[PDB]
Design an enzyme around this catalytic site. Structure first.
Site, PDB file in Angstrom:
ATOM      1  N   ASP A   1      -4.934 -89.967  -6.167  1.00 18.96           N
ATOM      2  CA  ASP A   1      -3.842 -89.272  -5.473  1.00 18.96           C
ATOM      3  C   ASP A   1      -4.069 -89.172  -3.957  1.00 18.96           C
ATOM      4  O   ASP A   1      -4.066 -88.071  -3.414  1.00 18.96           O
ATOM      5  CB  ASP A   1      -3.602 -87.875  -6.090  1.00 18.96           C
ATOM      6  CG  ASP A   1      -3.303 -87.932  -7.580  1.00 18.96           C
ATOM      7  OD1 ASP A   1      -3.359 -89.038  -8.153  1.00 18.96           O
ATOM      8  OD2 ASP A   1      -3.016 -86.874  -8.195  1.00 18.96           O
TER       9      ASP A   1
ATOM     10  N   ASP B   1       4.969 -89.295 -12.150  1.00 22.48           N
ATOM     11  CA  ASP B   1       4.615 -88.881 -10.788  1.00 22.48           C
ATOM     12  C   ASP B   1       5.402 -89.672  -9.757  1.00 22.48           C
ATOM     13  O   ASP B   1       5.423 -90.906  -9.787  1.00 22.48           O
ATOM     14  CB  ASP B   1       3.129 -89.101 -10.483  1.00 22.48           C
ATOM     15  CG  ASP B   1       2.196 -88.610 -11.582  1.00 22.48           C
ATOM     16  OD1 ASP B   1       2.593 -88.533 -12.763  1.00 22.48           O
ATOM     17  OD2 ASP B   1       1.026 -88.337 -11.247  1.00 22.48           O
TER      18      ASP B   1
ATOM     19  N   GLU C   1      -5.391 -81.893  -9.102  1.00 22.57           N
ATOM     20  CA  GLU C   1      -4.643 -83.135  -8.917  1.00 22.57           C
ATOM     21  C   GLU C   1      -3.586 -83.036  -7.825  1.00 22.57           C
ATOM     22  O   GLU C   1      -3.415 -81.981  -7.206  1.00 22.57           O
ATOM     23  CB  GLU C   1      -3.974 -83.540 -10.234  1.00 22.57           C
ATOM     24  CG  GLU C   1      -2.876 -82.586 -10.677  1.00 22.57           C
ATOM     25  CD  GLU C   1      -2.094 -83.095 -11.866  1.00 22.57           C
ATOM     26  OE1 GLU C   1      -2.719 -83.616 -12.814  1.00 22.57           O
ATOM     27  OE2 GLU C   1      -0.851 -82.965 -11.856  1.00 22.57           O
TER      28      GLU C   1
ATOM     29  N   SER D   1      -1.293 -92.513  -8.941  1.00 21.79           N
ATOM     30  CA  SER D   1      -0.534 -91.871  -7.855  1.00 21.79           C
ATOM     31  C   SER D   1      -1.118 -92.045  -6.456  1.00 21.79           C
ATOM     32  O   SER D   1      -2.298 -92.375  -6.285  1.00 21.79           O
ATOM     33  CB  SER D   1      -0.354 -90.376  -8.121  1.00 21.79           C
ATOM     34  OG  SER D   1       0.314 -90.151  -9.339  1.00 21.79           O
TER      35      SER D   1
END
Ligand SMILES: [Ca+2]
Length: 448
Positions: A224, A62, A319, A140
């Site tokens: 995230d 990522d 996600e 992330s």
């Protein structure tokens, strides 16, 4: 009866929109472009130290660009910057944030240099924080260049020792230029947790534990974080799961018409099949949400807000949350695995970017291309050109956004390390998107 309809004043990824995807998806408007295998390379600078202490080629996963407040790619003293999760597959459950950089005009994957890890392993033990000492992995997030010209990171603090606890976390990354073609990470400050769930609006790891998650196959998320500004206010949009008061997981969720959409016959037949089948548990536990919090000017929590959208009954995992303004409208994206979905006709091989649009930041999000489908990737996980973590990067001008992603690159013959995927363009127009045919860019390209 047991049937009801609660929207909870928020938008939903409905079963009705999802069931339509398999018949819609087989089209170059939506398909991730086929990538040329012979041209694919490892990131050259992507080298670090394994757990054994030896220097090796890293796998790179990522990645996110350093952005301006509106989402456009920032220039930092002449350089574009990308934060990337990387690691050694022999640690496997080891993931750290790396800082890569490239002169703004350079294009090739070989032009990307590595300033190394953002954090030293000792960095997390320095601040007086409720959570950081327990971190086991760096997951992330996003990066923003402040007005003050500071590099401000947001990432996910993951604690495998605390049952997979996930905390939204911030830090300022201190940078310097030893020479005219080099950037160096000096260290970090303002290193603090922001948010780990409240229980009512967003699920906590404790609720996950208490409900017997590791037995049931539940999936707890709080990760995230994506920075965004609107009307002077500062926000993070993030992957989460619903709390007890905005449509909690459980079997009652299967009776909630808001999650189905369509007509009554559709709802009645879909519900019947869900309550009957091997998917009953999976569906009941599925309570993914794209959450939003407001930050103070020091990047501490100001207000916990209701989710922008949920995917109750559909999946427990939406996600790589992404959001930006274009043409006066707000565009919300999320990646999703077919394997985590409960939808008929959607299989283990299916990977998606979904997309939604609203007139206001916290307003009603309506599906792009009628269903929400923006991208479809169905290459086998063994294919060299398998891509994942698709992310829309908004551009200074034009109707196109750049889609970045990583390429697992697990070939029999080298190169053979997870790397930047070739980027490509998606055209945005109103509530309708399209892959721009035959415009494949360089691996890891952010801007056109
Ligand atoms: Ca759940």
């Amino acid at each position: 009866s047991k049937d009801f309809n609660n929207s909870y004043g928020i938008s939903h990824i409905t079963r009705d929109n999802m069931v339509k995807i398999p018949q819609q998806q087989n089209s170059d408007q939506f398909k991730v472009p086929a990538f040329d295998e012979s041209t694919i390379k490892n990131i050259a600078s992507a080298k670090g130290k394994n757990a054994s202490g030896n220097t090796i080629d890293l796998d790179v996963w990522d990645s996110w660009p350093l952005q301006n407040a509106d989402g456009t790619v920032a220039t930092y003293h002449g350089y574009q910057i990308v934060f990337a999760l990387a690691g050694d597959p022999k640690d496997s459950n080891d993931t750290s944030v790396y800082l890569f950089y490239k002169k703004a005009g350079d294009k090739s994957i070989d032009s990307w240099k590595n300033a190394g890890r953002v954090f030293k392993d000792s960095d997390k033990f320095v601040p007086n924080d409720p959570h950081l000492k327990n971190q086991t992995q760096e997951w992330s997030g996003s990066g923003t260049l402040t007005k003050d010209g500071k590099v401000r990171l947001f990432y996910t603090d993951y604690s495998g020792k605390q049952y997979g606890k996930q905390t939204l976390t911030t830090a300022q990354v201190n940078m310097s230029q030893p020479n005219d073609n080099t950037l160096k990470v000096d260290g970090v400050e303002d290193y603090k947790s922001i948010f780990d769930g409240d229980g009512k609006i967003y699920q906590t790891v404790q609720q996950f534990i208490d409900e017997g998650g590791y037995d049931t196959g539940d999936a707890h998320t709080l990760r995230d974080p994506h920075y965004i500004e609107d009307n002077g206010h500062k926000y993070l949009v993030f992957e989460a799961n619903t709390g007890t008061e905005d449509g909690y997981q459980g079997e009652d969720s299967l009776y909630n018409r808001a999650y189905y959409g369509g007509n009554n016959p559709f709802f009645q037949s879909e519900k019947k099949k869900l309550l009957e089948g091997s998917n009953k548990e999976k569906a009941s536990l599925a309570n993914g949400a794209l959450g939003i919090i407001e930050l103070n000017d020091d990047y501490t929590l100001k207000k916990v807000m209701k989710p922008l959208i949920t995917s109750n009954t559909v999946t427990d995992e939406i996600e790589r949350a992404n959001i930006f303004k274009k043409d006066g409208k707000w565009y919300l994206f999320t990646d999703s695995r077919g394997s985590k979905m409960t939808i008929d006709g959607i299989g283990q091989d299916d990977v998606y970017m979904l997309g939604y649009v609203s007139n206001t930041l916290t307003g009603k999000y309506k599906p792009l291309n009628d269903t929400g489908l923006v991208l479809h990737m169905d290459l086998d996980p063994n294919d060299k050109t398998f891509t994942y973590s698709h992310f829309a990067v908004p551009q200074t001008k034009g109707d196109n956004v750049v889609i970045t992603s990583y390429m697992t690159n697990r070939g029999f013959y080298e190169d053979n390390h997870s790397t930047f995927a070739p980027s490509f363009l998606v055209n945005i127009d109103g509530s309708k998107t399209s892959v721009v045919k035959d415009r494949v860019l360089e691996q890891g390209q952010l801007t056109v």
